[PDB]
Chains A and B, each alone.
Chain A
Amino acid sequence: GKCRGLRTARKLRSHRRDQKWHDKQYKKAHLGTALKANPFGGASHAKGIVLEKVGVEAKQPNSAIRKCVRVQLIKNGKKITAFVPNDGCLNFIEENDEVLVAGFGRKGHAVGDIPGVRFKVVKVANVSLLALYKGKKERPR
């Protein structure tokens, strides 16, 4: 079993850190490639410009077409697919506009029906989509 003497501290602590490198969440935090491959670069939100509109096909038992957008981040230049949240809101997003994009909620894991799309647009032209969908504010250009 375990080494369980009284002078056995450095063996136990070496064992802890060595085996803790096999922890998936710990390694994802501390190998540091999961923060260098991360498109947001450890940011809660990014801001991008719309490159094109995309219809992503639904996954097998669900039959629909989900309205996504290929945007390009300002801060590094990467290409990211983002999901426009509510019904009838893709028309608010116009070609080449400033978009404030968030995560979708599973911390890098693709969420729900949309496959491989893990971000959602929160704001367009510095107006929130929730206000536009609820018909409270007006979108400038």
Chain B
Amino acid sequence: HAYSEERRSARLHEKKEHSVDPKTRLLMYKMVNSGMLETITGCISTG
């Protein structure tokens, strides 16, 4: 149990460390690389 329970706690810790958002940044990078957008200039208004 001790060894298993220790590995399970390691699993919960690694699951908490495995987790503009990065997904939106990746989508913007994919859209720029696809030729739809030439370059991202800046942010105009933050709502």
Q: Do A and B touch (CB < 8 Å)?
A: no
Question: Taking beta carbons and an 8 Å cutoff, which residues of A are in contact with B?
Answer: none
Question: Taking beta carbons and an 8 Å cutoff, which residues of B are in contact with A?
Answer: none
